[PDB]
Point group: C3
């Protein structure tokens, strides 16, 4: 008929005997004296439907095959995580169990009710696996900061690939009060050591304002960590939503780190796009768009942002040392910063030896009237170096305020001192109001002064200013009434090309030079009478002389002749006459000197001394007569 036998209570089964369970599944006896009921007791029985009873061609059991094949890539889904379900339990189970672990892929979205703690020395792979926050993640009251994925106090994690985080702030907005609120990061690692945190793409955080001891957290946050690496791509939803209160703060946030590397992209942040604070940290090509805070904040010590790509702030592109204890050798190493309401780069008073190199434009985008805040580079601090490249027309934005603005308020404990300035660009001013400032500039097309040095520039060296088709190359405008204000200020080489107004100086420099023979060759071919080959001209602004002629004194290398077949010197002097400075010359000539009269109708003379130290003039009579010594 058919094959069917149940267990018989009275029978002894030999080895290899097959029967059925009440379920229908077939059992074989492994023993010769089998009396055991396989429905109750599998002692000396095997189920023939077992994986361990299927054989591959190789000689491996199917069991052996499933075991080795699984152990290659242990997944969250192996632990019964479900995409579009709460997977919390399953996730934590997976982590606790598996040193190497696969999250899943781009089609996976695991819902998480509790903070996911990574484990020490583990390796995690991820193909685009998303994690989504749900209620309860904020954890226990007195609320302390949490994340979806956490590596707080973890050592030697590796993450290979892409992890995605989703926080909807609208779920959490009703929780806490005035004093205490949830803080929910995408990723947090506080006190992590030597971790590669792979790649993140994260939307949203939860960081509503609470009144005492408010702590901002990033979407992606690494705090108090050592030798950690992450890549992160965050969206803060600023300008993509309307919200009652400020939901989220900083995009990507690094704070009190040592030796930590970011590859960083931030948008739509209600505070700072990227903040990176600490010691020997690196921001590698940060890319920031449309942030309510500053695009990029650096502090700490020897923290460098390389090849920046910043656009669109309610504040500035770059703060150095904003709200910070320390900003020592915090550097920006090339890039582009555009469309800031205030400054491209604000180097705060805290800054020590910060180096900024930047292409920058469309600062001072504020509706608000011009201030120190509306600068390209706004510089305070101690011995900062600016390498400015700028253009005012760039990206069809209209600037407000100086290209560079370096300034103290007082010479007594100055807020800005020892700054080095290197500035090239088109169509705004460099303003300096700070001691010991070293200035190099190339400026094209400024309406006004290329460069001004105002008050409080004591001991500034202006090495070189080249100005093409400006209002004025340089003006020095010190505090006249105070010797201290302009003491030791050196204006070096000023280069004027088709500037409207001459440069304006103050003070007299002391210069020490090597002995020279200076040789001026004139190629020209032809020289008319009293033609200047080479001159130095000294002009006065004396009270006593009001009226257009102000030549005080001059030395002129002259063509003496209507042929240029003789040459001399013009030793120029001056005296007040008819409310003007009248000029006259001692003429140094081949075989003669000639002293010219002070004015028409005055005689000229030679003053000599007797041995008794009385003084005598030889002065012509208007006749061909004996010369006599006339007392003077």
């Amino acid at each position: 008929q058919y094959y069917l036998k149940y267990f018989n209570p009275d029978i002894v089964y030999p080895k290899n005997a097959r029967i059925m369970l009440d379920t229908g599944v077939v059992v074989m006896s492994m023993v010769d004296g089998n009396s055991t009921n396989p429905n109750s007791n599998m002692t000396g029985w095997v189920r023939v439907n077992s994986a361990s009873l299927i054989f591959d061609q190789s000689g491996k059991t199917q069991q052996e095959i499933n075991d080795s094949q699984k152990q290659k890539l242990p997944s969250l889904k192996d632990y019964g995580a479900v995409s579009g379900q709460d997977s919390t339990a399953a996730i934590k189970a997976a982590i606790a169990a598996e040193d190497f672990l696969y999250f899943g892929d781009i089609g996976d979205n695991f819902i998480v009710s509790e903070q996911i703690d990574l484990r020490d020395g583990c390796y995690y792979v991820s193909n685009g696996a998303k994690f989504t926050a749900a209620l309860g993640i904020e954890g226990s009251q007195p609320y302390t900061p949490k994340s979806i994925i956490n590596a707080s106090g973890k050592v030697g994690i590796n993450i290979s690939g892409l992890v995605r985080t989703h926080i909807d702030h609208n779920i959490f907005s009703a929780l806490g009060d005035a004093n205490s609120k949830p803080t929910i990061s995408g990723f947090l690692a506080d006190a992590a050591i030597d971790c590669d945190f792979g790649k993140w793409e994260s939307v949203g955080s939860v960081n509503y304002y609470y009144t005492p001891n408010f702590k901002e957290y990033g979407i992606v946050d690494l705090r108090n960590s050592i030798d950690c690496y992450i890549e992160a791509d965050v969206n803060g939803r600023w300008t993509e939503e309307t919200t009652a209160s400020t939901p989220s703060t900083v995009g990507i946030m690094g704070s009190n780190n040592k030796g930590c590397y970011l590859k960083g992209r931030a948008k739509n942040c209600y505070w700072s796009g990227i903040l990176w604070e600490g010691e020997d940290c690196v921001v590698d090509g940060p890319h920031v768009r449309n942030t309510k805070g500053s695009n990029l904040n650096l502090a700490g010590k020897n923290t460098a942002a390389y090849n920046v790509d910043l656009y669109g702030s309610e504040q500035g592109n770059i703060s150095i040392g904003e709200g910070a204890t320390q900003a020592e050798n915090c550097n920006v190493v090339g890039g582009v910063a555009g469309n800031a309401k205030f400054a491209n780069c604000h180097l705060h008073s805290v800054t020590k030896n910060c180096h900024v190199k930047l292409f920058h434009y469309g600062w001072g985008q504020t509706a608000s009237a011009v201030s120190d805040a509306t600068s390209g580079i706004r510089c305070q601090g101690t011995g900062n170096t600016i390498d400015s490249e700028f253009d005012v027309t760039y990206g069809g934005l209209t600037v407000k305020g100086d290209a560079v603005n370096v300034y103290c308020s007082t010479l007594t404990n100055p807020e800005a001192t020892n700054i080095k300035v290197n500035v090239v660009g088109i169509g705004a001013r460099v303003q300096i109001r700070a001691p010991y400032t070293i200035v190099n500039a190339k400026i094209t097309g400024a309406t006004g002064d290329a460069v001004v040095l105002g008050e409080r520039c004591k001991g500034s060296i202006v090495e070189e200013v080249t100005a093409i088709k400006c209002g004025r190359p340089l003006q020095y405008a010190p505090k006249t009434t105070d010797a201290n204000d302009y003491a030791g200020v050196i204006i070096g080489r000023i280069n004027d090309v088709e500037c409207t107004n001459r440069s304006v100086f103050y003070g007299q420099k002391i210069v020490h030079s090597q002995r020279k023979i200076e040789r001026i060759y004139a190629q020209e071919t032809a020289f008319v009478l009293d033609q200047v080959l080479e001159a130095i001209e000294v002009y006065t602004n004396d009270s006593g002389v009001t009226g257009a002629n102000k030549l005080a004194s001059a030395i002129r290398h002259i063509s003496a002749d209507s042929f240029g077949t003789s040459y001399g010197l013009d030793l120029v002097a001056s005296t007040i006459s008819k409310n003007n400075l009248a000029n006259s010359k001692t003429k140094v000539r081949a075989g003669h000197i000639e002293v010219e009269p002070a004015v028409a109708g005055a005689a000229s003379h030679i003053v000599l001394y007797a041995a008794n130290g009385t003084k005598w003039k030889l002065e012509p009579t208007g006749s061909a007569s004996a010369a006599n010594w006339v007392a003077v």
Copy 2:
């Protein structure tokens, strides 16, 4: 005997009853009243050889295990793609079905008959999987551009790993005509948004010349895309084959992109190695070898190539704005460019505010005679900055033409204006023929002039030129006949070390300086009679004076004494005598002046004025006699 039962037409099968199919496979009844013929009708039957009827140790079915294990890594080969077969159908099936997808490995080579379209938001992994083009890929007539893998109009692709492409142009060379041809890219993405395209290694393309509206495509091509990233390593087979016609064009081609990043390696390209055009695009360390076109072409706006590694072109290393509408702030940010037939870097007339920093050598490798094309840096455009580092001996190549060549043809709407030049190196010239040029140079070992400023240099500032063991530091050689030509040209500090010939100037600069006390200390220890401590010397090139002495006038700080126990001034004058300029001195001395005669046998004198403005000389008689006023 044995176990064998077929279906019986007359029998009712109880639950758990096992029989055989005619095939021999065993069936169990799931029902108590089974009358159904399992050969025809599996209603209430199960095949006992099913995966769903094998149980792992865990409690999972084998079916459940195969389902979860597959869904980890869905592959092309799961969809019945075969390596070394046409896999087109299978591929497209795989893509349509699977959000996450594995290509395969280095031993996989899938043959593709039709363009492979990726899908939006998908994640693709690849371990070296190769795709090979076959006939039909060119698609339908009127031929439009195709690729092996395509992401035209795709959003949010991720590619993890390495994809390899093979196009043999020899399959496609007979297709189209004069007017219409196939275009076959390795990879194309036209109008892609926010895609990471991982890593490519691609050989060959199909892009034969057709007569109207010819469109070049890359081996690897990203057109009209936003926020896309690729790495690509291409071979164009130029110099590895002989071909009737030009088969392929550009290696890696980026055109009208916004915010797109390349890591790029190109060789053996019949056009450009790498071209990258657009807005805010980045070329990160492009590595180009042996290209018939230019090694690297930049255009658009704020497109930067970082840390270039270019060698071996029939054209140049770098074109900026070749055949382009726009080349505004298109920058090269360090690297090395060598072995160009023409220029290392050609900044075309289109260029606005382009910055080039480069080590460069072995330009002008052409057999053809020296031209503007045979330059290190060939610069036209508006306000480009050159940072040149060069060496003519470098890599044992022999250069032709100037190190830097900045030039307009006319001052009226000049093709080059406002260029900034910073040049250091060994053993070639800097030539400037352009207005408003700012020059800084350090040149060693040039045969001729370190620097020349030719015609059309109006309003150029030459800040500093240091020349070691050149022919000449600087020559200024303007259009003499035109005041406009040399108007406002400033030659600053020229530094001559063991140059053969003195520097040659033209024009006279107007300089405004801060008031100085200048203090020249001479350490020497010993000074002979008429020894010059410090001098200024003015020389003439007057027509009227032909014959070697051309000192017009001088001021000399002099040791007056054969002991150096007295010091004075020499006020030097000159007059034509015996077809030479004869020199004579007013001697300013402690307690005297001394006017020397113009020539031997002439008397000296003092000219003074009477109050009636007649002039009188005191002139010695050759006796110890009364001095009289003598009319003059």
Copy 3:
């Protein structure tokens, strides 16, 4: 009863007949005339427990499923490698068999007895798989260098992910003798071509000192290779152990390479952290800590280290060309170097055209007295460019020796020539003792001289030195006795701000300038009698004059008047009187000159010539009397 039938010797089995083996496993006949004993002979029998006799829902066999699922990710463990066992055989088996191959994960540690040779064109993936050396790896006598993983003479490897290596030197320390020892690298590739070697984390090597022809190997070593890429993170255990002899040498070692890229991290190395030698090689952000050798050694040709991060050496941060044939255009492209016993950067005599740009501090940390070795930058070679940024206070370390020290020992075949120096920083000296040196400096807070130029500076141009609150801006201190020593040395613009002592010069420069009108405008408002508007002052150091007044000669632009309502010139002369230089003036004035007496009680005069060339003085009598010509 039950289901059980053995093979019967007398029976013919029809097709589909099932019996048992003596083992109990069920067999079905595939043939109608089966007479074959399945216990001895499986001809026309199948085992029903076969994978090929289980069917997935899809229609695939379980066999077909195991085959395709395995071939996705072939592993070492598939080949029966065991973690914490000797896996050598299994590994080599895996490699020989599989073009694509998975090592395993972070929980895998395979013990290796013999060098593992990779294969040409293969692709390897690794999730943190560790390999550990055991005895026998050193291989056969005469000992030749070995590694755990080897790619010597391999082409076109790819490695994706992270491989980890462990060498315990304590296993191998008893082997060889005086002449011959094991050399055991983590990874070695000698003569590899176009390989991506992914990522390494490696501890330890074996490289004990043997007396003739000692060859240092890296922990991670690439020798004589072309177009190879690696990332490597090594620990040499220096300072983590005590050892009898030097066990290991170089961390990461690149030697005679062409076009090879490193991402490099080294610590605790008994020699060099990272060495990279060859042609067109790149060290991308090398990160070195706590090394007994130099942190970083470059040689060869066009080898560049970018954005260095070096701290803590018994030697220096950077050697260029240490123990090398060639060091031509070997560059350091930004970064930070700190805490070297000797120099931050030593550019050896071999160096040609090396460019160094660096922030540097805490050099000369040695207990040993100041030498040339205790410099920030120690520079020898031919035409090296230094861009120095320095700070002596930085990181609370106390420096010893010059910031920069550029030096030859002789002008005859000089060890240092043609060096370019650009130096900014705080609180140490720049020393130059080398010909043709170009100097630019900005120095703050040096105790002594900002800059000194010593002996052997022939044909040096010091373009600009800015000194703020130094001891002295510049001193030039040549070999006085030798004209050659200071020939052609140009000291340009020296800027002194509140320096203690004036700059000290030697020699007189020849300067060629463009013709100028120089216009000095004085803004001041008020001028007293004999007030200097602008002056040049020439001072002597003559033997003959000992005693404080050393003004030799001067030209002074003067306010002539107690109102500043007249202006002139002061032409200053001097003569020895009462063991001082006494000053006197020719006064150039509006309508007069005035010659002042040499000293009180001397008369002044005018010297003129007769036509017979005899000389005559007009000199006052002390009366209102006839002027006579007095012979002189």
